[PDB]
Amino acid sequence: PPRYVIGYALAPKKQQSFIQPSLVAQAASRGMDLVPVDASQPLAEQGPFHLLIHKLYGDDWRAQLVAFAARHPAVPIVDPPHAIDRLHNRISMLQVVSELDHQDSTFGIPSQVVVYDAAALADFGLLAALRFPLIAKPLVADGTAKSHKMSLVYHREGLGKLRPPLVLQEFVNAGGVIFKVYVVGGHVTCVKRRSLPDVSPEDDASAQGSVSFVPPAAFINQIAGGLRRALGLQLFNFDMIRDVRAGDRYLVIDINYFPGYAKMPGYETVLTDFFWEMVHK
Amino acid sequence: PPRYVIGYALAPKKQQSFIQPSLVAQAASRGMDLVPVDASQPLAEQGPFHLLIHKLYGDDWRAQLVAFAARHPAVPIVDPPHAIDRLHNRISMLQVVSELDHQDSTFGIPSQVVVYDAAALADFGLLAALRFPLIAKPLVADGTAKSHKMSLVYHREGLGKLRPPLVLQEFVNAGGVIFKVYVVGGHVTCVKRRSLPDVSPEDDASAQGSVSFVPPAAFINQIAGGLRRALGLQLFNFDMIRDVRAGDRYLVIDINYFPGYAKMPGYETVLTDFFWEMVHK
Ligand SMILES: O=P(O)(O)O[C@H]1[C@H](OP(=O)(O)O)[C@@H](OP(=O)(O)O)[C@H](OP(=O)(O)O)[C@@H](OP(=O)(O)O)[C@H]1OP(=O)(O)O
Numbered sequence: 136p137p138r139y140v141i142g143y144a145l146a147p148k149k150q151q152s153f154i155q156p157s158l159v160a161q162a163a164s165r166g167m168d169l170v171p172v173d174a175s176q177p178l179a180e181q182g183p184f185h186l187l188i189h190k191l192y193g194d195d196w197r198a199q200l201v202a203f204a205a206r207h208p209a210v211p212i213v214d215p216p217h218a219i220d221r222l223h224n225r226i227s228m229l230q231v232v233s234e235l236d237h238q239d240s241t242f243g244i245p246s247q248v249v250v251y252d253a254a255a256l257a258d259f260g261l262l263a264a265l266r267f268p269l270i271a272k273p274l275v276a277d278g279t280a281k282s283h284k285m286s287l288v289y290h291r292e293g294l295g296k297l298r299p300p301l302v303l304q305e306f307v308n309a310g311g312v313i314f315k316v317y318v319v320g321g322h323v324t325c326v327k328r329r330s331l332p333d334v335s336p337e338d339d340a341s342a343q344g345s346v347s348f349v350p351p352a353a354f355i356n357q358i359a360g361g362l363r364r365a366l367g368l369q370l371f372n373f374d375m376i377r378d379v380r381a382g383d384r385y386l387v388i389d390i391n392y393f394p395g396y397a398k399m400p401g402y403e404t405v406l407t408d409f410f411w412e413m414v415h416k
Numbered sequence: 417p418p419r420y421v422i423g424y425a426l427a428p429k430k431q432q433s434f435i436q437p438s439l440v441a442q443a444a445s446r447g448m449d450l451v452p453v454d455a456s457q458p459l460a461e462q463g464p465f466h467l468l469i470h471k472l473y474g475d476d477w478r479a480q481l482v483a484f485a486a487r488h489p490a491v492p493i494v495d496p497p498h499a500i501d502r503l504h505n506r507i508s509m510l511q512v513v514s515e516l517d518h519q520d521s522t523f524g525i526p527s528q529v530v531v532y533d534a535a536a537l538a539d540f541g542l543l544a545a546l547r548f549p550l551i552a553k554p555l556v557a558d559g560t561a562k563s564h565k566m567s568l569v570y571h572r573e574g575l576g577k578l579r580p581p582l583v584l585q586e587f588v589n590a591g592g593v594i595f596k597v598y599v600v601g602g603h604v605t606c607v608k609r610r611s612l613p614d615v616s617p618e619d620d621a622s623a624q625g626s627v628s629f630v631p632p633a634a635f636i637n638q639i640a641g642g643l644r645r646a647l648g649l650q651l652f653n654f655d656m657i658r659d660v661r662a663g664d665r666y667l668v669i670d671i672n673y674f675p676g677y678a679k680m681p682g683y684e685t686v687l688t689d690f691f692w693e694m695v696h697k
């Protein structure tokens with residue numbers, strides 16, 4: 136009964152959250168050995184590996200994965216950098232998701248306003264017919280975590296202070312609720328987040344968060360399945376809203392590589408079954 | 417005095433316009449031999465080449481250029497497919513152009529509205545505060561020429577009939593004038609195109625086109641230079657408007673790979689000097 140080496144190249148803070156003793160031991164009990172990748176040596180001098188999982192960015196890290204992928208074509212990489220690239224530009228990302236087909240629920244993409252420079256952020260006429268609150272997000276991101284963050288914006292003044300180029304999306308047809316859907320291979324958890332039309336400094340109104348494992352479950356798996364086929368990613372979460380006008384249409388508003396799976400209890404079982412699948416194809 | 421082989425992989429219609437006897441003879445008089453690439457054989461069995469120019473798309477054509485670039489690292493390709501990729505998504509394209517710096521003129525990028533689906537094209541509230549006429553353009557293109565075309569749209573009804581995903585840009589601050597700037601290496605020609613706020617069926621008002629080789633010439637070369645450094649393309653034209661509110665700010669609204677250089681008289685001299693530079697680096 137052979138053993139599988141699962142290499143992992145993660146920042147220390149992501150190691151602390153995701154590589155917990157309970158995951159290491161569960162995986163070792165099933166013949167899978169989680170081995171940290173030395174950031175101080177080339178990847179080519181390390182291993183061998185039966186599977187490689189990472190959350191690092193840079194041209195050096197990318198070169199290594201290209202080298203590695205050429206030297207070792209059979210060894211799965213989670214995820215390949217070419218596939219994480221698809222998230223780099225918010226507008227290209229949502230385009231790749233739009234090329235899905237179709238069920239008693241429909242799923243669409245909300246329209247986006249792209250503002251490239253400071254000047255336009257002042258004097259672009261259309262901005263003055265937007266409804267608040269708005270989701271703002273930098274246009275390009277991969278790397279620094281702040282680029283991955285999506286802001287709720289309550290005032291025109293507060294927009295005027297964001298750093299362009301950014302993407303603007305209306306949030307008013309959502310009923311104040313975002314569904315964050317964690318995916319590993321085939322699914323995991325949904326966080327329901329409720330936001331409000333008034334900020335909190337403006338009026339003392341409340342926001343709330345709950346967890347489950349709320350939109351139809353057969354539909355969420357249909358979506359999650361298509362995102363994975365289209366993006367070629369195995370580890371992502373995706374933000375979605377109900378269009379509460381009809382009340383049966385859903386919209387994908389965001390996608391994030393390798394989110395915080397350790398926040399969900401029982402993540403160790405889900406990720407260990409995933410590693411098992413990946414090293415047996 | 418050795419001879420340089422300039423291979424060319426062009427569609428027949430593009431061969432008829434661009435590969436004229438006058439260019440073939442001018443280049444042969446200077447020791448450069450224009451050789452057609454056989455579309456019926458692999459590129460790897462043809463040549464050898466000192467320079468390769470093309471306007472073909474597809475995964476087969478791309479494989480060949482990747483093969484070729486690995487076998488022949490010193491041989492310049494005009495242009496490399498990785499660089500033509502930068503034009504594929506209108507929003508990523510304008511992002512790459514936005515990462516230029518800065519002169520008595522400024523240059524910016526107009527804001528864009530991205531509409532991904534039929535539903536949103538009907539019911540997205542912001543569309544109703546846009547000013548007409550609008551430039552509409554498909555979001556993704558490279559390949560079929562219709563995707564490369566940018567439409568002037570005069571009515572809301574006429575928008576309602578476009579195929580999503582598309583990008584919308586306001587055209588009202590331009591004074592009804594677009595400057596098309598042809599670039600080869602370092603510059604070439606400007607077409608001044610004048611469009612109007614009423615379509616022509618609506619009112620019998622006129623549009624006009626003139627040519628020159630109107631914005632400052634030192635500035636046009638500053639822009640053209642930066643586009644080339646940033647996109648890594650040697651053969652493009654770029655559309656630009658004056659913001660006629662101030663009257664000294666210009667905006668880049670579009671970029672097209674390898675346009676119709678043969679429409680400009682004296683193109684043969686410009687392209688032959690270009691081939692000379694390319695085979696001597
Ligand atoms: O800003 P980031 O470093 O990308 O961190 C985010 C962010 O955390 P902050 O509250 O510190 O900004 C999210 O919080 P929200 O702003 O979306 O509420 C959090 O989501 P949760 O609060 O729901 O834990 C998310 O975690 P996830 O990746 O699980 O979506 C986490 O991202 P990282 O922990 O991956 O960096």
Ligand SMILES: O=P(O)(O)O[C@H]1[C@H](OP(=O)(O)O)[C@@H](OP(=O)(O)O)[C@H](OP(=O)(O)O)[C@@H](OP(=O)(O)O)[C@H]1OP(=O)(O)O
Nearest residue numbers: 561562564565566596607609625653672674675676677679
């Ligand atoms: O639609 P495309 O095949 O991309 O053809 C276009 C288009 O021609 P149509 O008039 O047939 O649509 C342009 O015309 P406009 O619509 O912009 O007026 C023309 O520009 P000119 O009329 O100014 O010749 C342009 O040529 P260029 O590439 O020189 O910008 C030419 O593109 P191709 O000849 O490259 O296909």
Ligand SMILES: [Cl-]
Nearest residue numbers: 152153395397
């Ligand atoms: Cl985690």
Ligand SMILES: [Cl-]
Nearest residue numbers: 433434676678
């Ligand atoms: Cl031509």
